[PDB]
Amino acid sequence: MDVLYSLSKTLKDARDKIVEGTLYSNVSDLIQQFNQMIITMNGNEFQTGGIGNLPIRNWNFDFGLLGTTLLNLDANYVETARNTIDYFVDFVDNVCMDEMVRESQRNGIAPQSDSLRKLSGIKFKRINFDNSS
């Protein structure tokens, strides 16, 4: 749940802060967090949605890191970031929906969907950052 929230928060920050012409100093920490997220998620397969009419979605992560060398962000940087952000946002939305439609009488506080169960492993705990909501 903390890793899922951190993914969503990182993506929201990327959508709100990775904008054309912005100083790299405005995004440097965010770019580090985003690259950490990409590294952590790369090479992992996820499956979301086999309950009700929720479609089966398969997710593969093979993305390049964002650059750290610009002074102000330009169109190329924003386009690469936007493509990666779109894929990740779709993945996070599907994972959230898959988790929202499931319930358990025994351990209902624990994750129900297999995607969130996978995200609860130690290998994803690096993604975790600011939990302010």
Binding site: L65, G67, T68, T69
Partner: protein
Amino acid sequence: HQKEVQYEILQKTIPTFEPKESILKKLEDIKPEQVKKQTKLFRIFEPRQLPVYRANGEKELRNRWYWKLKRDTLPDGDYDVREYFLNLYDQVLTEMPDYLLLKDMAVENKNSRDAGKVVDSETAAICDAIFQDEETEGVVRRFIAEMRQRVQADRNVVNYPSILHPIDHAFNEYFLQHQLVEPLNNDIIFNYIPERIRNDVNYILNMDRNLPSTARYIRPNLLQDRLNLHDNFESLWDTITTSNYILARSVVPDLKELVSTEAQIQKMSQDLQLEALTIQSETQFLTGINSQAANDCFKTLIAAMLSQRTMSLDFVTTNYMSLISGMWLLTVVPNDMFIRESLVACQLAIINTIIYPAFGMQRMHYRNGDPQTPFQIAEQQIQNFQVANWLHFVNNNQFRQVVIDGVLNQVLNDNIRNGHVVNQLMEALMQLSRQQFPTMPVDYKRSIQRGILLLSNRLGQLVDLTRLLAYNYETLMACITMNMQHVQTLTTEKLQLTSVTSLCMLIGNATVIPSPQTLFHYYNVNVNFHSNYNERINDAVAIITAANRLNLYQKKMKSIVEDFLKRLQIFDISRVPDDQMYRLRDRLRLLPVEIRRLDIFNLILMNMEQIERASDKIAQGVIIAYRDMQLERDEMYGYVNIARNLDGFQQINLEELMRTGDYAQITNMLLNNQPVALVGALPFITDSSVISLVAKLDATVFAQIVKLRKVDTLKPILYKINSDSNDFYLVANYDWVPTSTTKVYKQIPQQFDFRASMHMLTSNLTFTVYSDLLAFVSADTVEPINAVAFDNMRIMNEL
């Protein structure tokens, strides 16, 4: 010959200095980060008196103070200017002080009426010049005569008046506000000692020095590897582990009071009865058994484990004494410390020469690439509990990973540390001495069993040796500061099993532990290497990031990476593979810049344009407007064809024009007299001749652009018409408006303002910076006879 050729092919890709041992010197020459002290305030600007002119172009009777670059050496061309500012960034970083004590730079203020002092002598010169100037305000003069320093010795604080350009003040204030010195007290030194050595009862640590409150020190940057050189840098990691292995060899203690080599050799010869056998190699059996080999084995084992450098096993299969000793070696040394082929070969020799023949089992037909080692198969296939249990331990005695004080450490099984598992080995091989060896010839069987008993009957000595080896490893591992990453290296350290036999058969009961000074030296070398590694990473990342943010697209990061590797002191850069160099570049590009260097770069970046426009030898551009424009009236020139901005003109970037080589647009505009602004750092000719302006020579300087398709020779004319011109009468005695078709895009110098330049610089009155903290620790050791292990029992109990 062929083997040497192939090994040379492999070694040419490893940046390890070929005389391995020489590396030690290179490792021990790395000193702590040199402490830099500022001797004078950092200045880019100085006040200078310049002549001024009335609106009619007549020189006035007074000069005016303006800020000018002390060293006006800016090059032409925008790219060259950005390179100049990168070089300025490097100069500032190298000359950046680690601390400042302003009292050192404080000098006497000549005009002070209250014994005033200022920092620095340049401020004194400026203040004297302003005091003597007739156009100075009386209030400013009285303040110079009354401004005072404040020295609070009880608080250890000093404030001094200074005159500085705002950029110079920014730099000096950053230096003053962000010094690297921290207060030093005995608690900090005590915590600087490794925590496991402070808890070891074999070492007595005392603090017999008093540190004044004015003591300072600079914290080493013991950040863990940001480049992850253990991952996907085979050659660099091979070099790193080789250097660590050499250092560890240097610090491993020497064994004392070893068994007499003559007595042990005669004993082994009598027991083995080799002469009575039919072994084709009768002499070679006991060769290599001596005290030198035993010491070399001790050093090699502990150093290899400390450096996590892979070891290869070199043995003659027919020498079953070597195999019997290798049984102990595999018992005590984790099996992941050996190259897989060597471990498999040694284990298969042990299985097919000793263990399976002992139990009458069919010789193992082991297959290379099997996920199981020969011992892992034997553990399942052997039913005897002694041998099977020893095999189980040997199979599962890999290093355990644990983080202590933020450092990853490879630690041993507790049964190795207390030496208890040797008993199991003894048990196992005692069983091997009772086995029938069904089909073996009886003399060879007797020789093997008597060798097994030779190792067996040294149970107490081997327990003592195992405890001593483990204790020495742990004590020297307390002194490691970089993560002990376990990787199978390209090259290995070759360990002779005859040296293992020497160590097993010659070790006595003389405990030898690292000296406290040896531990402190090892820890200091490790800290120095780690800090230098981190600092050079910071420097490389800073320069790469600055070059990228300065848009220095022709800069080769390869040179930066090579300089970084050279400053690491342990790489022969000529043998670094290119793929690894480029991977290093990529990983360095991803790291964030250290705060101090990044702040300095921000300062330089934000003040770049102001510094550039202060230069008197480059202009910021030239507008070619084929209409007649009146010469502006400027206090610094008289009449001058100066453009304050480029508004209203198409801009052609001269750097882009140079880089592309496409001169079609510029040529079309120059041919058709299309107004334009050529933008870029340009040298200009200062022309004071009115006749030159009438001759319109400023408009004659752009045809060479079309002719040569070059912009590096473009030198526009800047007119400076005033009463000092030889032909100024033409302006004065005739009715006309001096005009030109070209203007030079340049700025006017900033006037000196006393209120905007007078600052108070604050620092500490005095302190002493110390480098060797462990010099403040009085370290003694117990008698080796009384040295105990982690379990509070003596390391060697056979006494």
